[PDB]
Structure 1
């Protein structure tokens, strides 16, 4: 089950506490098709205390991927900044190269496999690149990048 892989990977980087429970429920609802309103979800995310900016960027990215329900919605600066990590030459260089590989992919595992060859910083940078143009890659490839990013992150701790 693909969506259960995303969910498990994403939750893995969130520290334990009541906030996590709330993130587990919202993720479950979005991945269940239980409607959703991007605008509302994002405000919520953007305002949660104790959540690392990066983790908000990863969640914001995931909610933007699924539950499109955008309707001309603009990109959230708070997602772009946490993803672009805001500065760090090099890593950005690796991000561009990964972005080029992912563009040739179509599947979740294919994207996930090649992505696991980069560090969390570059992976996050690459997510920031895709976020600028979500339609650059397929939804399955994007999801593959998300997990790898989360895998490398949880491994950092």
Structure 2
């Protein structure tokens, strides 16, 4: 498919959080064709929290093609300013070399290959060029390009969140055990509320949010959070395993 190969190369560049859980409803209802509007979506996406201007741009290049109409309205400025890359003079023709190449392709992987064998930042300049003409580059090709633009990025993270240096301090490794549990427990309040019982594991999750409120409220020793996530899951490995979704995945 082609729409389950674009959300994948688009949702993998966004940080993890309720932003990515909302965007993935907009992208969903955009493809399906619900009653939606663009300038609503582009304003909601310009005010946003943490998001690279490049990443606010790609999602503007996406929602402008996918939407059920050819509005052709004022090409919004946060995108056109985002995809130039602060005007690098050394790729103005390189993008045009690519824009004139991609004008010839008709399939998806034909473009993603050509665009991968290319720089990691001049692709945006082509995307900011297609965001001004969009005349002979069909949308399948363009999705081949953003899937390359966003794969050069996703590899930038995979070479980063693997080259990390884990922490030695206990204070920080105490809070990480509290965050993960207080976070994981807030989800389980939601994953259960849409179920039939919603009364045995909504509580087992709430108290592990209270117990974490207490440690911060008491100044407890960092040797107390040890085994807090995995001890939460075990207590609702019965209710929220078959009367819920599943477990041994959140850890």
Structure 1 residue 94, shift from structure 2 partner? 1.6
Cα separation, 2, equivalents of 1:30 and 1:129: 23
| Alignment correspondent of 2:85 | 85
Aligned-partner SS, 1:65: helix
Cα separation, 2, equivalents of 1:136 and 1:8: 25
Structure 1 residue 43, shift from structure 2 partner? 0.6
Gaps of 5+ in 2: 156-250
The alignment's C-alpha RMSD in Å is: 2.2
Whether the aligned pair in 1 keeps the contact of 2:9 and 2:150 (CA below 8 Å) is yes
> Which structure has the highest helix share of the two?
1
Distance change in 2, residues 1:95/1:72 (3 Å) = closer
Please give the per-residue CA displacement for 1:17-37, whole angstroms capped at 9, x wherever unaligned: 111111111111111222320
Cα separation, 2, equivalents of 1:19 and 1:129: 28
Structure 1 residue 49, shift from structure 2 partner? 1.5
Whether the aligned pair in 2 keeps the contact of 1:38 and 1:69 (CA below 8 Å) is no
Structure 1 residue 72, shift from structure 2 partner? 4.2
Cα separation, 1, equivalents of 2:144 and 2:112: 4
Please give the per-residue CA displacement for 1:132-151, whole angstroms capped at 9, x wherever unaligned: 11223111111111101111
Distance change in 2, residues 1:72/1:9 (3 Å) = closer
- Equivalent pairs counted in the alignment come to 156
Please give the per-residue CA displacement for 1:53-108, whole angstroms capped at 9, x wherever unaligned: 10010000000111053534110111100011231121333211111100111111
Whether the aligned pair in 2 keeps the contact of 1:108 and 1:141 (CA below 8 Å) is yes
Cα separation, 2, equivalents of 1:136 and 1:78: 24
CA radius of gyration, larger in:
2
Structure 1 segments (4+ residues) deviating >2 Å: 68-72
Whether the aligned pair in 2 keeps the contact of 1:35 and 1:67 (CA below 8 Å) is no
Cα separation, 2, equivalents of 1:55 and 1:2: 20
Gaps of 5+ in 1: none
Structure 1 residue 120, shift from structure 2 partner? 2.0
Cα separation, 2, equivalents of 1:58 and 1:72: 17
Whether the aligned pair in 2 keeps the contact of 1:30 and 1:36 (CA below 8 Å) is yes
Of structures 1 and 2, the one with the larger relative CO (CA 8 A, separation 6+) is: 1
* TM-score (normalised: structure 1): 0.93
- 1:137-156 aligned at under 5 Å gives the runs 137-155=137-155
